[PDB]
Amino acid sequence: TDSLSFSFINFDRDERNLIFQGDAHTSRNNILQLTRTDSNGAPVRSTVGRILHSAQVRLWEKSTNRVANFQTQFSFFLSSPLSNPADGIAFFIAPPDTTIPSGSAGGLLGLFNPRTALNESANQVLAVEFDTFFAQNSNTWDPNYQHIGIDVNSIRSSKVVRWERREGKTLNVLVTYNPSTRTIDVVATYPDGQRYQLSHVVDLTTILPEWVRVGFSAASGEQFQTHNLESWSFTSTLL
């Protein structure tokens, strides 16, 4: 596979190219609802949902020292009745057989096991997190504010920028990887022009295997919110 691209303007109840994990489901409004809701659509405690595209990405080739670039765009909104809604949504990249770790329903965002969430040698994941919950006695790795973070094999972000959750409002995001500069760049905006930018230098060939899957994860622990993925496009080329 030397190039791969796909897009979801919205999400289809009869989709065939998504792997659904945990509580992820497609709503009647063509929204990918990652986390569990009750019969009235209200968010509930202790839930993880994830999606991965069924098509795998060749991120690099050992035999030839080629590396892929990628560009991905997505939009989402979060809703909750709580003053401290939790826990957040992340774009992520992981080995193709990745599954939801035990104990990941909460501040580990469906990406990490509590026993190894800070142990880089035990993980293989790149994530861009939109983290709404930062209580310092439970999310001890977090900054003391809502934030966007680039995560490399750890729930402790390598880089963060302060971010403002806006109840019910859509955030649009562009994430790119440049293999020649080994840079992940993140740009996120709200419709009124409020902008967030974050970057981190990481050689993805050192943290991920040759073939990966890409997708999204979200979770709630004892505090909760819906995590509503509205759209997603992805392009990759193996230079």
Ligand X SMILES: CO[C@H]1O[C@H](CO)[C@@H](O)[C@H](O[C@H]2O[C@H](CO)[C@@H](O)[C@H](O)[C@@H]2O)[C@@H]1O
Ligand Y SMILES: *[C@@H]1O[C@H](CO)[C@@H](O)[C@H](O)[C@H]1NC(C)=O
Binding-site positions for Mn(2+): 129, 131, 142, 147
Asked whether the beta carbons of 11 and 189 are under 8 A apart, the reply is no
- Which residues does the annotation place in the binding site for Ca(2+)? 131, 133, 139, 142
Contacting a copy of itself within 83-112 (CB under 8 A): 96
Binding partner of residue 107 among a copy of itself, ligand X, Mn ion, none, CB cut-off 5 to 8 Å per kind: ligand X
> With binding defined as CB under 8 A, does residue 75 bind a copy of itself?
no
Distances (CA, A) of 104 to 55, 57, 97, 99: 25, 25, 17, 11
Q: What does the alpha-carbon distance between residue 128 and residue 107 come to, in Å, rounded to a whole number?
A: 14
Strand ranges for the chain from DSSP E: 3-8, 18-22, 25-26, 32-33, 47-53, 57-58, 60-61, 66-79, 88-94, 126-131, 147-152, 159-162, 171-178, 183-189, 195-201, 211-220, 226-238
Tokens standing for 107? 């501040």
Binding partner of residue 15 among Mn ion, a copy of itself, Ca ion, none, CB cut-off 5 to 8 Å per kind: a copy of itself
> With binding defined as CB under 8 A, does residue 29 bind a copy of itself?
no
Which of 9, 42, 44, 122 is in the footprint of ligand Y by CB under 6 A? 122
In the complex with ligand Y, the residue whose CB is nearer, 119 or 140, is 119
- Sign of dihedral through CA atoms 94, 96, 101, 106? positive
In the complex with a copy of itself, the residue whose CB is nearer, 1 or 140, is 1
Contacting ligand X within 209-238 (CB under 6 A): 220-223
The owner of tokens 């892929």 is 68
Q: Which residues bind a copy of itself (CB under 8 A)?
A: 1-9, 12, 14-17, 53-56, 58, 96, 210-211, 233
Q: Which residues bind ligand X (CB under 6 A)?
A: 86-87, 106-107, 133, 135, 137-139, 220-223
Q: Which residues bind ligand Y (CB under 6 A)?
A: 116, 119, 121-122
